[PDB]
Amino acid sequence: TELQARGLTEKTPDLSDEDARLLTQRHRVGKPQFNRQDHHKKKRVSTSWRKPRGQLSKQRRGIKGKGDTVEAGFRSPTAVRGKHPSGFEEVRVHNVDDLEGVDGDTEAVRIASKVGARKRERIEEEAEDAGIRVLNPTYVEV
Amino acid sequence: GISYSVEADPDTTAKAMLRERQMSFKHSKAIAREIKGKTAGEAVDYLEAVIEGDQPVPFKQHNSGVGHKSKVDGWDAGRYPEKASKAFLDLLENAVGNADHQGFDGEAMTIKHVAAHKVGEQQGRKPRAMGRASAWNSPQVDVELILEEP
Amino acid sequence: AEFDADVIVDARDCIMGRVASQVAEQALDGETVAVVNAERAVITGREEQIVEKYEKRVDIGNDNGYFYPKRPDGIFKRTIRGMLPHKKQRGREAFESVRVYLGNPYDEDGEVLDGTSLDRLSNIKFVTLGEISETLGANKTW
Amino acid sequence: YAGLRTPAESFGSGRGQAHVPKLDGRARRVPQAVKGRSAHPPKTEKDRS
RNA sequence: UGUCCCAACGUUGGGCCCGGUGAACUGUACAUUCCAGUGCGGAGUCUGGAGACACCCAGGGGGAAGCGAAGACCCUAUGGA
RNA sequence: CGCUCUAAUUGGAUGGAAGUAGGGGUGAAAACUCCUAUGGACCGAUUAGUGACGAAAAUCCUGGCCAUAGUAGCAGCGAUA
RNA sequence: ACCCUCAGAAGGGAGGCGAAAUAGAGCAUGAAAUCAGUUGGCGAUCGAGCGACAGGGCAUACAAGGUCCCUCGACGAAUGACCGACGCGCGAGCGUCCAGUAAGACUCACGGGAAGCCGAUGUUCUGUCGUACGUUUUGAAAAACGAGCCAGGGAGUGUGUCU
Ligand SMILES: *C(=O)[C@H](Cc1ccccc1)NC(=O)CCCCCN
Ligand SMILES: [Cl-]
Ligand SMILES: [Cl-]
Ligand SMILES: [Cl-]
Ligand SMILES: [Cl-]
Ligand SMILES: [Cl-]
Ligand SMILES: [Cl-]
Ligand SMILES: [Cl-]
Ligand SMILES: [Mg+2]
Ligand SMILES: [Mg+2]
Ligand SMILES: [Mg+2]
Ligand SMILES: [Mg+2]
Ligand SMILES: [Mg+2]
Ligand SMILES: [Mg+2]
Ligand SMILES: [Mg+2]
Ligand SMILES: [Mg+2]
Ligand SMILES: [Mg+2]
Ligand SMILES: [Mg+2]
Ligand SMILES: [Mg+2]
Ligand SMILES: [Mg+2]
Ligand SMILES: [Mg+2]
Ligand SMILES: [Mg+2]
Ligand SMILES: [Mg+2]
Ligand SMILES: [Mg+2]
Ligand code: NA
Ligand code: NA
Ligand code: NA
Ligand code: NA
Ligand code: NA
Ligand code: NA
């Protein structure tokens, strides 16, 4: 009578102490939006980042308040870079064969959006049986 | 053209529309704004008083240069848009008629929804001095109305 | 009429600027202050020059306007406002929780703030706010 | 000759307009103009071997 | 002899309000300003103060170094006629 | 990093492709990805190629659209109807 | 189609077809600028590059994020005390000891708590910084030049030779 997600939805990965420390760091520190300069002043100017090149650009000149300029120093910790907020490493999956070789303790799987309902069902049931979590599960009424 | 922008329960609702009317779109926002919430019958009486010139239609947004009117309450600028008013009478005549053919008491129904939409312009061209011409267009208006049982 | 002042200050024979500076600081700390006997507040210096300054302020102006008070009432209040960011929310709140009075409409005798009193016995060059207002043309309503 | 088949000319300064070749009050030829030539197009002469 | 002293009253068409018709110029953004200062030395927007409840109608045009025109003067180009 | 089309290898789609709207996650970032709705037939990935391959600007070009504004004009003419 | 409405072969209402009429005639999809109505936030005593980063209010169906709050305790870089004891200084105050102790960001563990609750998103308030962008220029917020807004279009290419 209610919606229930298929699979090991509550499953958490197991991480070394250092990795969970680093993962927690990333989450606490965050980063600036890094949106393009003045994207908010002109609709024709989108948010996507572009290096400010004006010789007089306030941002390019690093004037405080004109937003941060992309630099390597803003990089996330090597050990956690790319991990799902849960700690898992994602594995893009298109069919049942893609599930092979996937460590359900360390990795979770994401079913490509193009995959249809029929194949998703099969992927979702065999992924669960392999102990693998599906980040984007189907919600059936049970 | 438009489609009803508001949902309406067929069992306690009556609908009506005007299509591509060549009349002031600005006068229509004003009229719609003013008669919403009124009774179909109240709306009709109101509009005839506007046409007659005894009742002003508040012009709250498109009021540049418009002269104040004593009868306008809580505001100052107003006019007597007879053309658009006549078109709305047609709209109400239709709505109330539909309403009756369905068993309701048309006149007593409330104007739950009424809105005007500019659907285009009948393009025109006016010859000007120096061998040039400029636009001379006519607005085309659509308007929806949803009556509802009290 | 009726002002729940957490503090009642007596300006009689006190240095206006030094009183104001302290009344400003307290109002910004959340205190409701009332300055009493403004007309008897004093300012050091050569009366001739002092008066010239205030007379200049009265004369200054234009269509935009420069409303400067002549009564010892406002003179004092304008002095305080000059020590508060009266255009900011916080500033305007503090300023509005401070009122100056001619004489003392309270029952309690105000207190004298430290370092604000002027010893008439060792000082001859100074003036009374009331004297200034009379010079400015005010109506001695006290 | 795609986009070059026209005698369009530029009015130059004077009418609050950009110096763009026009014909019958319609911009032409130049690459930034709709129906204009292609600046650096595919070329038959290119050795693709 | 209303050109002037020195302006008045009047006539007609507008102007103003109402119905209908219905453009254009112009628009980086923000914008209720004023006085001073500062700044590429001629600021609604910086700095300090002052003033400032919102919206609307009519006006005569002080400012936006107002709009309009890639200065027609002057110089420069191994330019043109 | 992203775009087009070619090739090899290899996948997805009417149990709903691309696109679009709103929303969730990742990447310093170019950008990648998911969810919901819409849509109703196409769509990728890796590797090696290919090139009329990336826009905020040019008084840029074309089209569309807002303010201007219910504003100016629909009075002026020795033919005031 | 039929019926009601209407000056009406218009339009509208009701209805019928089809998987779909939000496929109904310049009719696939249906972006932005932008318009009507409406929802959330602000709002008729208050100040202008419109924001970035902090932090509060109010608002939020699910999904695709799941964290967050307080007691206590563990760990604890740099830094680093009060009080009290003694000794100086005209004085503000300083020295020695207490003590590199108490404290000390992050992180974790036990217990307790939140589900509009944490993140996130919309708007708004407070703090700090802040006079667009691009170009010309020794120097641009510039009273130097460009653009009303949006979408789409818009600029190192080919042959030959040489290195
Ligand atoms: C001399 O002073 C010139 C005379 C002249 C120039 C060209 C044609 C006829 C007469 N006058 C000017 O240069 C005036 C310039 C006006 C500039 C206004 N922004
Ligand atoms: Cl890197
Ligand atoms: Cl309109
Ligand atoms: Cl004044
Ligand atoms: Cl202030
Ligand atoms: Cl003395
Ligand atoms: Cl840590
Ligand atoms: Cl190049
Ligand atoms: Mg934008
Ligand atoms: Mg008027
Ligand atoms: Mg002619
Ligand atoms: Mg062409
Ligand atoms: Mg100021
Ligand atoms: Mg020139
Ligand atoms: Mg000459
Ligand atoms: Mg010659
Ligand atoms: Mg391969
Ligand atoms: Mg550029
Ligand atoms: Mg006007
Ligand atoms: Mg004539
Ligand atoms: Mg006559
Ligand atoms: Mg269509
Ligand atoms: Mg110079
Ligand atoms: Mg483009
Ligand atoms: Na208005
Ligand atoms: Na009234
Ligand atoms: Na009124
Ligand atoms: Na003094
Ligand atoms: Na004055
Ligand atoms: Na031709």
Ligand code: NA
């Ligand atoms: Na060839």
Ligand code: NA
């Ligand atoms: Na005369």
Ligand code: NA
């Ligand atoms: Na003017």
Ligand code: NA
């Ligand atoms: Na132009």
Ligand code: NA
């Ligand atoms: Na907020």
Ligand code: NA
């Ligand atoms: Na330039």
Ligand code: NA
């Ligand atoms: Na600039």
Ligand code: NA
């Ligand atoms: Na300047």
Ligand code: NA
């Ligand atoms: Na325009």
Ligand code: NA
């Ligand atoms: Na190109």
